[model samples]
Target: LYFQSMAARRALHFVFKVGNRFQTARFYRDVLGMKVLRHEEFEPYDGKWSKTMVGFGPEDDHFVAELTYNYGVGDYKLGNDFMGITLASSQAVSNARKLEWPLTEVAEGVFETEAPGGYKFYLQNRSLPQSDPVLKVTLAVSDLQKSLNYWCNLLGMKIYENDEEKQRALLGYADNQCKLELQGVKGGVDHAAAFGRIAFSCPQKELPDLEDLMKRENQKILTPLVSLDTPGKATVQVVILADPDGHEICFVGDEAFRELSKMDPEGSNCWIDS
Candidate 1:
């Protein structure tokens, strides 16, 4: 029998805030092999400060760990027991050591690093494929059965139970997947929390078809089309998708993601565009 299991997809992205982001960024790109995916500097109306930050990731995948350094903002608070996102990497512990990454060794195969923005993520050593896993954002749903109808029935996600008493289930399949936890909350009988987002890989040949599919699936556009400022290239194509519960899932094409992933200032491999 083919027993199915709910894995945390293949990739995970973490967002963090930090000061001296440039210095931290240099640490990653120079010290490690992570490349820069996409970076933008915005001079807002409150022009006193600017956000000078870039996204970074490994050589293979587009899973990004974003670093946002708002001028004049220093140090962020880390809530208790809040260890950041966890991801599966191709070159687990050995890679970390080889790259001399910042994370401290917590367990045998697990490595912890304090990301630039003041968040933490645990990297685990596992024999997963090297295709670079997509983010399996988890959502907190009111009714698992109803959510199943929308995502599973309508959207086409394969469901798998995580825990019986806890009522957690994994949905979706292929590269982009989602896992929803059905827990009773104080909001009401029908509140939903958005998990993270993932990118849909369509070929250069299929770009047009992918766009059509997205329009048919999603009605509202959350993020606008923006140009990625790279060294040689001027821009890249990207769009963001939001789930029913208000979660942003970005669909960055494979080429763009790869370009940015390799350009990361820091040598670490992980990034996500928030």
Candidate 2:
């Protein structure tokens, strides 16, 4: 069953680990037409890290990208865990032509490109008229059936596409929003230090219910439902879960998340005291 209210569900953002912040920001803004919604720095319990939120529209209604940068870390190992993020944006293809960015047409109407730090992005040559440019985030799964059961049946996502020959499936929480693409890998999935999290928002009333459901199914719940404080910002409750292959998934209360994810138009690249 899905959330009772439409407001209770949405794919938030796919967290990405980047090596260079400046270049990453330029690619997303100039090439992808995404704006810098907010920026903040944090002293990682052991090191320093920064976060920049970029997207075509407000997080309240559109899927976004969250780039994380770690100090002194120039690069990361490219694990098979992530495949690529796909977007149906003719504007992005146009930007690549205007900016002379390296782009290759992988198919008739699809182009393959790389963001900074070796992350892959597939841009559909056609425009997404009514929906967000981003169409889906692709990740590698060890077992197709296992991942399907975890993301589809247990998580209540609708299977939009299933390609048995390719051993891949596309699933989403809503029909009109960005979807998740699961590609079956040969062996166990490896999420190096550079791995990131995928976030979703649900009704506040479902937080406990979700936790209970996971426990009843004997699934791995990374973090139980709990309130997370962000200093001056809004406090929100979240529950973290892991797929069979160890892909991290986060679920937050939609009501408070909408407040916590408000766009800061004047946000700059500044460090926040940890």
Candidate 3:
């Protein structure tokens, strides 16, 4: 029972499939006060696309956002599955006010705003965190108990706080990383077209074991274990899974990801050119 906590897993970043490439970039970097960590352009296979990593700090310590831009995708239908991401950053709140970004007072000290793709975010009016300012990503679920079974039992995330009356649970693999909060909604969860995927990095040896676990447990395996190489960066092995509501979850090899996630000096230049 205690062995589950021994596994070395980290919440790396969350991927948002965006259509408006440049404006979305500005929202994250300018309004949110984040930095461009890494940028990569993929060759046209299904469609030409690029992925940009933006965060307050390095991916090693900060949970970042991977903005995925597929060229020609002008818009995506927003759904209820993605509730909003909460960040404790008074600086970001101030930045939004300076930019004349519209905001609503969701709480006494929390402000609510949306990105270009309609991704909602909760901004807290407090001193910016020295570490990851992202507090948690809230997701909606049709059945909280069922979702809890998969995330807690199968995924090995400890429930830090469970509010039965509210029908929501706060979960995380470690105490230091950003947590995942599942709030129950009356209707079922929907991904629509603007779906996103949350990513985590684990020990390389755990990839096969995890895939096998999902296979034997009759869980959904979105993608089989596969290795992908960045042109000159690194080849990283990854397996993608889906939860009860079909939220995409990516688990990558931490060893290779450490090499791949290194902040590129030219990432800012590449993104500015786009």
Candidate 4:
């Protein structure tokens, strides 16, 4: 285990607030070649919302995207908090070119494209030979050193790389899993209306320990450990947290999460009626 004492395993998924389901699904599937793994309609905290999971493969090995649709919310304003989701997929780049999707070469062999709802995706030049293509999720923060301490020292994430001159750092729980990239935004951070949550999974017994650790350090706990249920699915325990910049972070029980995250291709029935 990377954390040694704690046993946090993989970075699970990044949650996105979406307005259109079918279009978003199409962009991830058609353009990115990700499969609609599972879909569900639920009300978190008894508030109406629908969720869909899409990814390259099973959640046990691959990191996925969780799309949340709030009832009657047709759009959301983009904030500088989220920089982009990076993926290692040459095929996605080719798919964009073949489909005539608007793509720009941001760097040599690095392509940038926008998904539905203006979400940004960066594609690397090489192809991912295995299930997980997701490389890292980039988020803007106010102070790189402070954020680095929180993620590395407090949270026990391994600092993979640090570019002091560029004011950026990459950290991850496990080397084989997707990393979280933090970049210092000169003006500061703003989540605004379209804020998203990044999720990680650890041993079920480690939930309270992590919560206690955060509280011990006087870190922000967005929500105390609570049970969130999805009708017809496994109810899992999670604790919501916030970094110094107020970026939402979620830690869920890994064992039950694996069961809940299982792919249900046929259950993607929430597709809007055309």
Q: What tens digits encode model 1's per-residue C-alpha lDDT throughout 1-274?
A: 1012222222325444555555565544543334555455555125433322232334344445555556676655543222245456545445556766676769887667655544455666664563443233344555556556545543345666556466566554544332333332334332122122444432233334434544665544666554445455434566565545444555455555555554534423333321
lDDT of 3 by residue, 1-274 (tens): 2313446888888888887867876788778988889888888228878888998888999999998888877788999889889999888899899988878887899999999989999999887546789989999888999999888887889899999999989999988899999999996788988889999998888888888878777989989999997877899999999988899999999999999999877666766535
Model 1 clash tally?
32
Who wins the lDDT comparison? 3
- TM-scores, in order shown? 0.50, 0.91, 0.95, 0.93
Q: Model-by-model lDDT, in order?
A: 0.46, 0.84, 0.86, 0.84
Residue 104 of model 3, lDDT score: 88
> Candidate 1, 258: how far from true, in Å?
3.1
Query: What TM value does model 3 have?
Result: 0.95
Clashing pairs in 3: none
Ranking by TM-score: 3, 4, 2, 1
lDDT ranking from best to worst? 3, 4, 2, 1
Give the Cα error of residue 236 in candidate 4, in Å.
0.5
Specify the highest-TM-score model's number.
Answer: 3
Per-residue lDDT of candidate 4, residues 166-194 (tens digit): 99999888878989999988887978888
In terms of lDDT, which candidate is stronger, 2 or 3?
3
Better of 3 and 4 by TM-score: 3
> Candidate 2 residues 1-274, lDDT tens each?
3432244468999998888766776688778888878776676226987777888888988899988887888788777788889998888999988998789998889999889877899999988676788999999998899989888778888889999999999998888888999999787788876787899999888888888878888999998988987656889999999988899999999899988889987754332311
